[PDB]
Design a binder for this molecule. Structure first.
Ligand SMILES: Cc1cc2c(cc1C)N(C[C@H](O)[C@H](O)[C@H](O)COP(=O)(O)OP(=O)(O)OC[C@H]1O[C@@H](n3cnc4c(N)ncnc43)[C@H](O)[C@@H]1O)c1[nH]c(=O)[nH]c(=O)c1N2
Ligand SMILES: Cc1cc2c(cc1C)N(C[C@H](O)[C@H](O)[C@H](O)COP(=O)(O)OP(=O)(O)OC[C@H]1O[C@@H](n3cnc4c(N)ncnc43)[C@H](O)[C@@H]1O)c1[nH]c(=O)[nH]c(=O)c1N2
Ligand SMILES: O=[N+]([O-])c1ccc(O)cc1
Ligand SMILES: O=[N+]([O-])c1ccc(O)cc1
Lengths: 480, 482, 480, 480
């Protein structure tokens, strides 16, 4: 049976060691700084039990068990679109894609292991044959069985970008002890999203020139593993849900994980020791976060275009021709994201293990296109609003016997409903003019590497050549 | 048979009255200023007789007749993809999409009439029951039977944009007589591409506020109709095909058409008199040419990105990290044009007559995306080339006993083949640094309306509202009633 | 003598009727939500008593009295640059232009009345000869004598932009009674910055098609005038000045002003009744704010560029060639703002009253250049920082016995000083990733009209003609 | 006496060895592919004899000799503005800066040698003391006395950018012999503008990593020197001055210069042998070109803004609110170019020999801002024009008895003067839609290095650091 939100909230009180800013958290489920986002994860579990949402949110496995669609493997295009429809519905149900690391996103990358588990084993170095491909699949099947949230921590510390030789002093997680039972790791996974809210840490690494084998670690450990400390930025959750209808729903915390001589049994180790394996295989893990990112980009673009339509109608600028072509840019951006999502699904291919994967070039350049344009799209939405994005009644001002009459008249545009402008303003302010909204903009910018990173890695991986089928047309037109 | 290139060249010498700059043209087929682009249209006809392309270029109709795919109707997605592959093959064969108004593009717009002819008739005003839906279909079948090129002239004179009342004085084509046999028209179809190379003129209008009813004319007349004069800009064809391998292939002339009391029989009149009809129906005619524009935008973006890969490889900048992220911009643009074309095909719908149409929002916003970015993408290609885009040996300089050794060494980059940098330069120069090239850029910018018009017209036609689909998620998030 | 901060804070306890969000404010000088920005105005007054700053902050008037430079009139280029060095020093001393409506800015616009007071009187309609030019000059000499902060409220309600016929239903402030003693005004000045912190409201209006005579009001009244209510957005001030060294310094509130049958004596009315007068004259009042905006833009661009130099040096990206050209964008933007400032001062002209005014075209197109670019410049600073702009230790995380050694290694870039990355993070985050910093971005975007309005008003006022000296070069090249 | 156009044309027939595309040129003065641009240089000389221009075009030296202002040294801001007015007048008189390498531009860079000749001598390696500062001054005085055009050729071959080793296989000009009379140079100066039209070649080089001593050459040699071959791109001059009123005026040819064992006496060698000397000193020579570029940029932007004003008035779009804000962008761009020119003049400094040099950062960042925006500004001008930029009557079509009536009515917008739209179209088409105009855009893009190069080279030269006066405001705000 599928986990409930109540079971998830109970499970959070497991002794995990967690800083949120200056404070220690006794219980992530109940602490003021964490309880609203924890309840957003609780809401995610409870969506799967809804009889009205069952056909979208669940599937019947070959054994006849109803399971959550976060565990659904896609082997053709129809099945990919069914998975995409699930992810899309989850983000619409949760404050218009305002919580981008729900468990469905975290656990999606596990499919790279399921698809082709052998290389993780065969390419391992210094494990003395202890790592079994069979044991990776058994862990992922365990996660599925208990609807466990595995939060992915791969990225390096941002220590010193001047040196290629600065991966020896780096506090990056290292294997300090290999024995008969497992590994002992010491150091830091420098960055992760929502680990304080997860069940297990999915530990990984990306290749950087000169990475030592003792820092090449793929594994899983519980969030309450002795020697694990979760260290998070201050919570940006807001007290008043009337003034802050989105930001009061909770803050998806980011931070680092300190490992103090942490023991991981070989059963929960996926791969150690091979920098060459860390070149391509970790990209294949993160490809699924990258495809999902496009589903989010389409939904964010749709929300932004909708808010521009609502605000320009409510202040009455929507028929001004020069405003009409500015709304067109925000609508065209949404259509562009939609087009990349649909085309990447059309031009997909089968992986080694028979999973259907969307076209890498289309979704990854679709991500570059979003990051290139998104700050300008935020500028357009806010600029189109005028003052209505920020200078609007608080609720007790609106309802005051003296002020009400003035506010109703000041907000009386062509689609009447004066208070609706305050509702639009609250959402624009929360999304784009609060620390809470700013974190999400920063998250979109970095989580999948920033623009100059997406372009570089996309070119390195594609290995585009004048002699390859790109330059076919150019060579023919040139007489070459 | 399908018409041949040589039949086309013979057909051109039909007494049509043609200016090309300061010169009159005796025979468009043979005149130095026109014969090259005439030969590109002959090449287009001859692609349909190439045995290795038979399956891409022709189909068998329900009567067992092999015909040019330019006449093929698409009723599902599979059929639309076979028509797109035909258009794409034509532009790839024809100098990397350097000739955007070959007959397959011109004739594509006629499918709107074939799909739903009746409203052209029913909505006409003042024709006294003479216009017949069946006669529109009969003309379009006659064009198909003879593989005739119907060049579309719709757009108004650019006279005075200050006030709609100024259209009182507009020299735009007007009905000046209606009789039992047909109409007489007098004035100008102010702008058209390739009319000097076509068989028939396809006349129409777009609504602009205060367009006079006497200027709402949809019809067809031969290019050599008595009273018609074709008046074209100067030809930009280049003499030396070694130095200009693209611009020596000919210049797709644009210009205006003068109609002096031209008689058109009712049989060749599709619609008169109704400004309301000219709002939605002409946009449905040009939908097919906007979809085709997406195919051209993909192929052109592919060419630019390819040229950027070739020149950065040859001068040896391609592994410099800063240059690599700039080439990724050009490749990403191509991938975005690819995404819009595929997505528009996937999200299409059936027209009232059962034709499958690609998604209007996607191809039109894709066109807007292209016009917004293309100037910057040409800058990038030229800027990535450095001096190699412009400052290179002429062929006699290259082959000189004294200069060859210096040129060979000056062009000796990581992929050897020194003379190849000149081959790449020639193409970059022709496309983006000659009059011939700039005309194509200006064509792409204006032919399907410019960026601000694309945006205006797409919004007006779509009428997106807070209470429609674009408001649903925002209304939910804001807690606003549906 | 020149007002002190202590006198200012004492003067706020005057009965003024003030909302800040859902709360009524007992005393703007002492209330938790207002006291910090009130102390920022007190610091402003105190800067004029600092002996090392006397030459820059004060001048000796013809009477031999020392006065604040906010009262200095400039009749030549040298005098303009001396005024500009004062404004520049104020915003540098006050958190790098983080408080853009200090009294020196508010009061700057009064110079337009001083330069040529008569037309305000003579072009008035319906005042029965009660309005006197000498009284306008007397009010402004009174503000000077007492160092009074006159907050300008001119802009209309954002009610309904669909209609030029909106002006009929406008809750905009209107004259409801005229008698022998003065006018009674009823309705709203819909938007103003810092009015809760000012002494007087400078009332005025901009022309709009069909503006009725009864809404053409230029006047001044105390903030504590009976029937005046100040209604402000919620305060964005932060409690912890270690985590938030800028946002803890106070929030420059924006809001509206309600007038309920408010009496203004004729002596404090500058002009009523003439729509035509409201076309060009209000633009001449606000010219001084537009010139001043170029000084702030320069200082803001210099801060952004410097923050980019500091963070790229500290994370070790400053010598990566592709980062060096990005940093060059931010520096070039600063030089562009400096270039417009200096050029506006060089190409100035004398007004009717003999004041020296900088080049309108250079400073207004300068403001347009700033709003076209600033969003992308912030995107660039944040993007250049990577995670360091958001994910950094709180102070108690930093100093913890366990986490300190990890934090010090993770922040050990090429210029040592690990903790300085947290220092730089905190400023980037206050400025562009908090509620507080976002208000300043929105203020900059709208206070002097947004980009499309700057362009439209500049073109409308300039009346550029093909036949004018503008197009002479084009005419000669064309042979027209 | 100042040189005349006639003396200059006479001097071109001196046996210089010139390719223009596939053709050898008997005489640059009279050949169809060269005579028009040679006549533009003749017009340059003849401008200095127009009695109405003598005050702008000439000055009286200490001796009492009247000379061309191209030889005027500026020792203060007032003298610099006088030199700028000269350069501005030349480019306004000559088809609105369509001919950017007139002799006044070429010869401006000689001022760096005059200001401080000693270092060129003292830093020379391997010349055995034969190079003398006095001879450098003697050559530049000889150029002045005879009004000689010294065309600068510094930039390297663009052979292979992948390799720093690339400097050994380089066909770049190298010293193959040194004797007691002078040097023999063999190789290529790979790029120059207008050398076929010049009197002398001014040879220089810029530093690149691993440049050998034997390629560090600064010298002067006649264009007709035995063993010099000038190899030019094909000429883009147009035949019909009515259809092409700018492109028929001549094509400013670009090309390479071949040296086969060319002898240069020590008397005309400025420096050899020191790669370190080639780091900063060549940048000081080209500074004057970079400042001059800012004058051209202002004139070009003024021409583009004027054409937009002219064409929008003629077609009747000039009052459409949405077009009005587009034209504001082009006018804004001109004002920005004006601001940088003026500010650079205002914020200049004295060189070691006491010449006044304008602010390097402002003029080099001004060039960056121009190259970043120019392509968008061309797009806007062409887009604002509609078909009128390209599709217009030829003169014989216009004057045809049948076609005239139709063309008059088609071009009868709100300011009448139908044929004037053709006059405007012809200039837009020549500048931005011909071979000839595109060469000028390309020239503007590359001649002072392209955008990414300006940014990289300006940052490397400035040595901006967080601890420097740059980062003072940011350090203060951060509490560092
Ligand atoms: C809010 C949030 C949330 C998450 C994460 C980040 C953030 C901000 N991350 C980590 C994230 O992927 C990481 O921040 C980005 O890859 C960017 O890396 P750095 O922050 O180290 O900047 P970095 O120092 O790499 O880059 C900083 C700037 O310099 C530029 N630059 C750096 N080197 C360059 C070069 N050689 N050439 C050109 N330009 C260069 C970059 O392009 C960028 O603009 C993460 N990770 C994870 O594994 N799991 C997670 O759940 C999350 N979640
Ligand atoms: C933070 C802050 C602080 C202040 C102020 C605002 C704000 C936000 N203001 C008022 C400020 O000047 C005002 O917000 C701007 O001029 C914008 O006016 P609206 O808010 O009504 O937008 P408005 O409704 O005018 O504009 C909305 C958007 O639509 C566009 N648009 C509207 N009409 C258009 C048209 N006809 N053509 C094309 N585009 C059009 C605008 O360009 C903009 O993008 C103010 N005022 C004051 O007097 N004293 C003060 O101290 C302050 N302080
Ligand atoms: O100008 N503005 O108001 C803006 C611009 C960008 C942004 O992210 C937020 C607000
Ligand atoms: O090649 N270079 O280093 C150059 C070239 C031209 C210039 O104006 C400055 C520097």
């Amino acid at each position: 049976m599928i986990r409930t939100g109540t079971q998830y909230l109970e499970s959070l009180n497991d002794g995990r060691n967690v800083w949120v800013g200056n404070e220690k958290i006794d219980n992530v489920a109940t602490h003021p700084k964490t309880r609203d986002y924890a309840q957003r994860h609780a809401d995610f579990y409870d969506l799967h039990h809804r009889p009205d949402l069952q056909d979208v949110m669940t599937y019947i496995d070959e054994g006849g068990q109803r399971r959550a669609m976060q565990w659904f493997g896609h082997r053709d295009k129809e099945q990919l679109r069914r998975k995409r429809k699930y992810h899309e519905t989850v983000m619409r149900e949760m404050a218009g894609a305002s919580f981008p690391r729900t468990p469905d996103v975290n656990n999606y990358v596990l499919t790279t292991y399921i698809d082709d588990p052998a290389p993780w084993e065969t390419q391992s170095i210094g494990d003395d044959g202890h790592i079994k491909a069979g044991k990776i699949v058994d862990f992922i099947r365990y996660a599925r069985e208990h609807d466990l949230n595995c939060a992915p921590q791969f990225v390096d510390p941002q220590m010193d970008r001047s040196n290629p030789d600065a991966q020896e002093r780096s506090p990056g997680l290292r294997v300090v002890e290999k024995n008969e039972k497992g590994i002992v790791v010491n150091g830091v996974k420098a960055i992760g999203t929502g680990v304080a809210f997860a069940d297990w840490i999915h530990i990984g690494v990306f290749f950087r020139p000169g990475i030592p084998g003792d820092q090449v670690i793929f594994a899983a450990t519980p969030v309450n593993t002795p020697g694990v400390t979760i260290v998070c930025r201050e919570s940006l959750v807001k007290d008043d849900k009337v003034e802050h209808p989105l930001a009061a729903q909770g803050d998806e915390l980011d931070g680092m994980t300190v490992f103090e001589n942490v023991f991981i049994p070989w059963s929960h180790v996926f791969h150690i020791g091979n920098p060459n394996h860390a070149k391509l295989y970790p990209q294949r893990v993160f490809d699924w976060l990258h495809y999902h990112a496009l589903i989010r980009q389409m939904v964010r673009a749709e929300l932004v275009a909708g808010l521009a339509v609502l605000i320009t109608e409510h202040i009455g600028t929507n028929k001004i021709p020069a405003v009409q072509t500015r709304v067109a840019k925000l609508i065209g951006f949404h259509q562009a994201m939609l087009a990349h999502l649909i085309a990447s699904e059309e031009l997909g291919f089968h992986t080694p293990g028979g999973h259907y994967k969307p076209n890498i070039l289309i979704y990854d350049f679709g991500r570059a296109l979003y990051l290139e344009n998104f700050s300008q799209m935020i500028y357009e939405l806010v600029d189109l609003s005028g003052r209505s994005a920020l200078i609007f009644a608080s609720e007790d001002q609106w309802n005051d016997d003296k002020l009400n009459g003035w506010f109703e008249r000041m907000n009386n545009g062509p689609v009447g409903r004066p208070h609706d402008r305050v509702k639009i303003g609250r959402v624009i302010r929360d999304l784009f003019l609060t620390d809470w909204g700013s974190r999400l903009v920063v998250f979109e910018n970095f989580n999948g590497t920033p623009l100059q990173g997406i372009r570089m890695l996309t070119m390195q991986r594609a290995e585009f050549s004048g002699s390859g089928p790109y330059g076919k047309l150019a060579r023919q037109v040139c007489g070459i």
